[PDB]
Design a protein around this nucleic acid. Structure first.
Lengths: 732, 368, 732
DNA sequence: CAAGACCAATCTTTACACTCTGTGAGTATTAAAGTTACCTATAGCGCCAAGTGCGCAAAGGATGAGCTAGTTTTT
């Protein structure tokens, strides 16, 4: 029923407004002070409605003199009920004396008809003002109106942490308020006579006992509520999670044949509960909600069209949020509090309605965890997860550990729609330059993918006036259209670019798209992992893998090594010896000193042979890097993968040489060549260990990491700077 | 904030007055040769030269000094996040409306009050030797001696840049006093520049009585301000303020509505009708928008000419885009506060659609 | 440093033994009563150690007469400290006389030297017995031993749900008992004189003031602990989550220079906390733990080799468990309580150490959620998630909603190792028959995958004696080994089977592998979704899609429809008209009555044309099902898909016909034809809604669903029966 | 015309002087430690020297190019 709550200059609120209340309104956030202040404001307003003496609230700033609390009630159902010719009770006529009479006698005969269109809504506004000298003022100077509003829209507050399970006062109050019987017609004497006749060895014995008890227990007479409570207790057969479930179920069941719509606030429903217990609680609430719904074909006795009461609950558990989003759907909303730069509570709505049914069905804990984050990094592949979640790398940057990295697709991004919740949850979308520009070998021209066209259309804004810093960007947009053909020349048979470096184009795209919270990496993640400055570390890691992982297959190492040395040549036939001697094994047994020396000599000879072969077969320190990058399922320069080149039929010599290298000395790396194998983590750990062994100070290691890895370190630094800039707001 | 001696050297005066500290010379005031006397009607606007030491000092004062001193929420003008719609919004809950105007708001601000108001935020010390104080040095860049009234001292000109912030800061105790007075009477008060709007939700004749205006005058007499009796308006159930109509009859807990009259939208409707009637752009930009390209600056550096059809077209597009932005602001205000009549919403939606279609047609005709 | 805790016949324990404790022991489970009972047992034991009068615990059963609590302490470090010749002190000699005196005087001169002084670990066992008459007895009749054990191994308990932030008693208790200073050497008179000298206008004023105060406030003298607390308070400069963090940090820091090893228990560390707050708490604890570690090259001042104390956690939050697993690694363990059949608490260890670094780095909230489950279903593809997580399907079966479904590969399954916690968390692994048997077209023979060989090897059990009923398993294994060749015949050009049906073999392998918690489906998920009995529903769903999703592209529907009817033939050229008129759109505009009638007529004509072509081109009605389930990325009978058939170059006519159907008529269905598109959810919802409309009773609709979908309903029923069998044990 | 109603915060507390160690009758009578303060600041557009500037606003090639700027309110 309540549709608007407005607070001005009170506690931690400067000017806050809340509207659009659903049935299952949910509140999450990191600023618990704001939630506590909102609860205090609501309780203070409802206490002042009942004429109770309480301490006035404090002001946010002393440069003002007033504090306002405004409530709007949707008095539509009551207006329809009261103003009907079929209703002639005392209560209806009394209601049409303080709610809909003052605002109707001032109208005329042409607008009263227009107010009965069966599509309009009637609102009642009540404002409470607190002055500087602790004075309370109301917009309506009539206590009867306040009493009627209080008795028509009760407020119930439940605390789950500090709850007394032995007290059932809320249950009794809810039962007494939601009744349709007049208990005053029951004759006390008749009931006493009935009981006395029921239990008696002589007529008139229970009456004498009751009279004797009353003659000495003489106290104040029972009130009406006490009498109805006693009658309910004598009528029923019996007297943390169970209490709350009973409260909610009773509230839903009783509020079906009455025009009283309570509002219930629940604080932390998941205190001391198993996650399955919370899920079952939400599911039971949803089932009770759906049992009493009469929509379209669903009809019959026991099904009603009465509106349900509004429910507010604050939680810190993703399970309850997940269940609420999956089950209720259109009948729920999520509120986020946060803070401001100078310090002031905010209120924002987080999108929680998804059109796609698959997304709702496959909804899991990660999606709910995305809600409880202050910075989200969206990535597409599974290698970005392996890189950005490294424990050793995150140890040196205690600012990027506060972000959450999520694998998102185009449809997933569309369904989530992070743009709606932008000021509450900052985010960055990291993609590749392949999604925008596509290059071909046969026809030496670029092409623009539809995502680039959509971004250009979004950036191009019409129906606008002139701005100084607006035309230049548009010019760049035009330049992007000029990249429609963009004829370029490729050397080494479509393997490299003679000119037109993609770095400048990527930088310009990033500068343009920074307003849309997007970042386009120049190359793939593994492209940044292995580059010209990290090749020595990659070679050292390969050498360490050879030294450690490779073990003698035969249980006796000395005899096998001697036989293979006397059988195969140590220099010309080194490759067959390495293939037939050393194998990859999890266990690494320790051999004899002579055996260890022989194995070390063989490994050193193999390392020297492979180093000489790779340095001789390939020219400069630019083809080895490309060969390694293309071997681990990647692409470089021309945006062509190893598999794509075979389909396109180009660079036969390069592919043949790579295939020869794969079916030769580098045969132990074949399992790690596949994507999502685990080489990224091992390489990162080895590099971190080497650098922290070489350099002692915690700043020199970070500087060397930045030197070796410019791109990922730049991304991490930018994200950390953004988080630190917005740290004062998203922190409890 | 507390500005000290070092703050004025590295923030307030970085390169404009840096040579007057080592020389130990007092900072001069603004001479009569650095200002203009732009006149419009019965008003005088004091402009300042762009290439002057004081203009950059004014920019720095606005950006770093006159943006952190607290204000009062009753001021809806010259502040970050304020608007005229926010000045009219709180009064939708009232049944009686009253309007007041301050006479010569920027000319009645005594410089002593300005000096006292900024005193707590500037420490008491000496800037240039034992001859000039920091407060006086700062104030020398925000004041001008009016030659029209030689008897008067240094005043705050209307045409400067720091004037609105100083006016908001100085007119803070008056806002607090008026708000405290109105709170006890249950009257909603708002202020925009020097216009005060009062709303009463209860059924009473307080806003139509001489007692209210007498009390407001008595409160304003502390600082010497006055209100002109030629702009005194007090009505019930409806009020029009510069084309903004606020209507609320109300018996108990009723919410009013805000709309715009047809006279407010007359010019845009005339422009749309003329454009749809194929009237040439020559008679549209000079008769309705009133934008003219004078022969004194008709491409003073170019004799090529023959560019009127582009200048007029883009000026018309800018005018239509500005009006569309104004209507979009009104729609956003309605969305965020829900205090606009539905029929007016339909009318403005239709007008926006018509304006967008006309802009598209103009662009297509220009392309063809 | 306790090693073993044994409880027999007390509360809810019959015989429970806990050993192999680590530093970060974590306790999870559904049976909170068991955790409460364990805490009560520990507190009772430590209260009886200190000679406190408390109520004895209750017995699990009255058919016994004793209840025993056994504690084992690892007294190895203390023995090394005391027995050294370098340490000559009162406390060391007293400890030797109390602990290691009796057990060492009964040994000869051979066991003491070179047999107990090299690497042996010393243990001390203490037993507490409760009789039927509420009598308490000890295995060692010496109060000094109990006092020394209590003061050497203190126990601390922290409750976070009800914690008072104004009380710092645990902090002062930890500080007072972890210091190496003798405070009895600070004379009162000299300190009073110093204070008087520091602050005085006349000499002696402060001393006289103190004497006058003491002469009036004369009470009991300070104890030693009060004096040391006052000295600490005057020395220091000042005095829920913060309190716990301070306690843990003080405990870690102060024990680095003492031989006292406390034991700490913490209940609900995450009550009323943001998930980020709990993660930060665990991270800070780990950082402080790693700061004071001196291992291998890490040395220098401030780093120690002193063992860390034992910490126990009672949590219900997956975030804390995830952080503990990721950070600590090998220094943590996870405990699961559960119940028994007749009702009794158990204790089991859940595997939490992983040898794969990628798995640890990619560890997320779903893996932690897998811990808090009672039945896990492991699947490979993403379509199984879309099928088993459907809300409408789970609405009719309120027994499969208590199980959690997870996508795991072979490496993920190996890392998780569900078989270790088999008795605590039942699980089922669902796979396809293609993972065991591979069929070929060019060569008419089956082949067995390495997984099948591994399963056969595991089933085969050498080193065993004869057992009736075990020879059948051997016969089945022999048949599986000998079916390697299994010459057969394929009809329809390598498309079907002569008579194999792949059903008897699947049933036999399921019966064999039921002991390994595995189930092999006869066909894929799409095969089970659309079968011979689901053709009418699939056709109705396609017709509904055509009726709803297809809309007029042109803004004016009537003019476009009239033009296309007068341009294209209504019967012969119906396909071009449908392609050029109706398009898929999210929004469905409402047209005029005549336009709606024309659109309905066109749609009916298109439906008639498609059904006639379908029933004319194919006759046996089984090739229809084959084509439908093969176009949706599936394989049938021969285990072949589109790509596999194209590579094999077989069934050219069938592939060409399917391509013609896809690119000629069903052009609109193509986007809903790729893997992970969302057609499963839509089809399931439409079918369930139709059957609900047709049949009202729940039994009738369940029977109809079982008839339409046999395999998935059978799987759900089997899982539900398994859950119901173990429901009593795995439920608090 | 003249008028009572003349903001909040300006850092925060705390406390006897004496010669006498228990007592004090000025014509107009706070102040010194502790403990945090905090602001805080950077390119139309491009270029080379990489921000402290210079040049140009025709390309381009160092001074022909060439060129405008939205609504409303206060006022």
């Amino acid at each position: 029923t309540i549709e608007s709550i407005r607070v001005k200059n009170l506690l931690s609120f400067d000017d806050v407004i809340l509207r659009d209340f659903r049935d299952i309104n949910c509140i999450i956030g990191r600023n618990n002070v704001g939630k506590s202040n909102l609860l205090k404001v609501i309780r203070y307003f409802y206490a002042k409605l009942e004429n109770k003496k309480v301490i006035p609230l404090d002001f946010h700033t002393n440069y003002n003199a007033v504090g306002e609390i405004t409530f709007t009630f949707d008095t539509t159902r009551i207006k329809k009920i009261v103003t009907s010719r079929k209703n002639n009770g005392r209560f209806h006529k009394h209601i049409y004396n303080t709610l809909f009479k003052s605002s109707s006698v001032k109208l005329n005969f042409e607008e009263l008809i227009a107010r009965k269109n069966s599509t309009n809504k009637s609102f009642f506004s009540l404002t409470l003002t607190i002055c500087k000298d602790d004075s309370v003022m109301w917009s309506v100077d009539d206590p009867k109106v306040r009493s009627l509003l209080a008795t028509l829209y009760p407020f119930l507050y439940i605390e789950t942490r500090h709850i007394d399970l032995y007290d059932w006062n809320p249950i009794w109050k809810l039962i007494s308020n939601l009744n349709s019987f007049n208990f005053d017609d029951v004759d006390h004497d008749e009931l006493v006579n009935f009981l006395d006749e029921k239990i008696s060895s002589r007529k008139g014995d229970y009456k004498k006992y009751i009279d004797r008890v009353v003659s000495v227990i003489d106290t104040k007479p029972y009130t009406y509520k006490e009498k109805v409570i006693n009658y309910i207790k004598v009528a029923i057969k019996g007297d943390s999670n169970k209490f709350l479930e009973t409260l909610l179920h009773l509230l839903i069941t009783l509020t079906r044949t009455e025009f009283i719509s309570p509002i219930v606030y629940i604080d932390e429903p998941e205190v001391g509960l198993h996650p399955k217990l919370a899920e079952s609680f939400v599911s039971n609430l949803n089932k009770i909600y759906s049992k009493f719904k009469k929509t379209s074909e669903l009809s019959g006795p026991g099904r009603y069209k009465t509106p349900y009461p509004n429910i507010f609950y604050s939680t810190h558990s993703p399970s309850i949020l997940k269940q609420t989003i999956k089950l209720f759907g259109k009948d729920q909303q999520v509120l986020h509090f946060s803070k401001k730069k100078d310090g002031s509570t905010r209120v924002n709505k987080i999108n929680s309605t998804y059109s796609d049914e698959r997304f709702l069905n496959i909804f899991s804990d990660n999606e709910a965890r995305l809600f409880f984050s202050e910075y989200i990094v969206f990535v597409e592949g599974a290698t970005e997860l392996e890189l950005f979640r490294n424990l050793s790398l995150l140890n040196l940057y205690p600012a990027f550990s506060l972000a959450d990295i999520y694998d998102a697709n185009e449809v997933i991004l569309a369904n989530i729609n992070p743009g709606y919740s932008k000021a509450s949850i900052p985010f960055v979308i990291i993609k590749d330059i392949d999604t925008l520009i596509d290059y071909s070998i046969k026809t030496e021209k670029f092409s623009l993918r539809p995502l680039f066209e959509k971004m250009i259309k979004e950036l191009t804004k019409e129906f606008d006036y002139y701005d100084t810093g607006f035309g230049r960007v548009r010019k760049e947009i035009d330049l992007f259209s000029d990249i429609q053909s963009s004829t370029k020349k490729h050397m080494d048979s479509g393997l490299f670019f003679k000119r037109f470096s993609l770095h400048n184009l990527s930088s310009r795209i990033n500068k343009v798209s920074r307003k849309l919270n997007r970042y386009f990496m120049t190359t793939t993640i593994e492209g940044a992992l292995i580059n010209e400055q990290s090749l020595p570390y990659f070679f050292n890691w390969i050498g360490d893998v050879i030294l450690t992982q490779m073990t003698i297959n035969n249980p006796n190492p000395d005899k096998f090594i001697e036989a293979m040395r006397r059988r195969y040549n140590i220099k010309s036939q080194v490759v067959p010896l390495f293939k037939s001697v050393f194998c990859i094994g999890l266990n690494h047994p320790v051999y004899s000193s002579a055996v260890d020396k022989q194995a070390l000599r063989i490994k050193l000879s193999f390392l020297n042979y492979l180093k000489r072969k790779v340095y001789s077969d390939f020219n400069n320190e630019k083809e080895i890097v490309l060969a390694l990058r293309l071997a681990f399922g990647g692409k470089t320069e021309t945006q062509y993968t190893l598999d794509k080149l075979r389909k396109d039929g180009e660079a036969e010599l390069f592919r043949e040489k790579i295939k020869n290298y794969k079916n030769n000395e580098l045969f132990f790396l074949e399992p790690q060549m596949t994507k999502t194998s685990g080489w990224v983590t091992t390489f990162l750990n080895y590099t971190i260990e080497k650098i922290t062994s070489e350099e002692s100070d915690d700043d020199r290691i970070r500087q060397k990491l930045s030197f070796i890895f410019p791109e990922i370190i730049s991304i991490i630094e930018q994200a950390s700077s953004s988080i630190e800039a917005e740290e004062s707001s998203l922190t409890g | 904030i507390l500005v000290d001696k070092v703050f004025y050297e590295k923030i307030l005066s970085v390169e404009s007055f840096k040579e007057n500290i080592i020389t130990q010379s007092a900072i001069p005031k603004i001479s009569n040769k650095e200002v203009r006397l732009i006149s419009s009607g019965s008003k005088i606007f004091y402009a300042i030269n762009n290439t002057s030491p004081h203009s950059h000092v004014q920019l720095r004062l606005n950006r770093f000094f006159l943006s952190h001193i607290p204000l009062n929420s009753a001021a809806k003008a010259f502040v970050r996040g304020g608007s005229y719609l926010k000045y009219l919004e709180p009064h939708i809950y009232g049944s009686s409306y009253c309007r007041l105007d301050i006479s010569s708001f920027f000319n009645n601000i005594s410089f002593d009050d300005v000096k006292q108001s900024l005193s707590p935020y500037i420490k008491d010390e000496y800037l240039i030797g034992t001859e000039q104080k920091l407060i006086d040095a700062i104030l020398n860049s925000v004041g001008y001696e009016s030659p029209i009234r030689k008897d008067k001292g240094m005043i705050i000109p209307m045409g400067f840049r720091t004037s609105p912030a100083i006016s908001n800061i100085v007119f803070r105790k008056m806002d607090l006093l008026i708000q405290d007075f109105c709170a006890k009477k249950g009257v909603i008060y708002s202020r925009y520049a020097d216009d005060m709007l009062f709303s009463n939700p209860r059924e009473s004749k307080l806003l139509m009585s001489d007692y209210f205006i007498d009390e407001i005058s008595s409160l304003l007499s502390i600082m010497g301000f006055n209100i002109n009796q030629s702009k005194y308006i007090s009505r019930e159930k409806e009020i029009s303020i510069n084309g903004y109509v606020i209507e609320n009859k109300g018996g108990n807990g009723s919410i009013g509505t805000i709309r715009l009259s047809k006279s407010k939208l007359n010019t845009v409707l005339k422009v749309t009708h003329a454009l749809a009637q194929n009237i040439p752009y020559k008679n549209i930009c000079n008769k309705y928008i009133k934008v003219r390209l004078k022969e004194k600056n008709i491409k003073y550096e170019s004799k090529k000419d023959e560019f009127e059809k582009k200048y007029y077209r883009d000026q018309l597009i800018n005018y239509l885009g500005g009006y569309r932005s104004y209507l979009i602001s009104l729609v956003k205000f309605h969305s965020e506060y829900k205090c606009v009549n539905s029929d007016f919403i339909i009318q403005i939606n239709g007008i926006l659609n018509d304006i967008q279609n006309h802009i598209q047609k103009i662009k297509k005709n220009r392309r063809l």
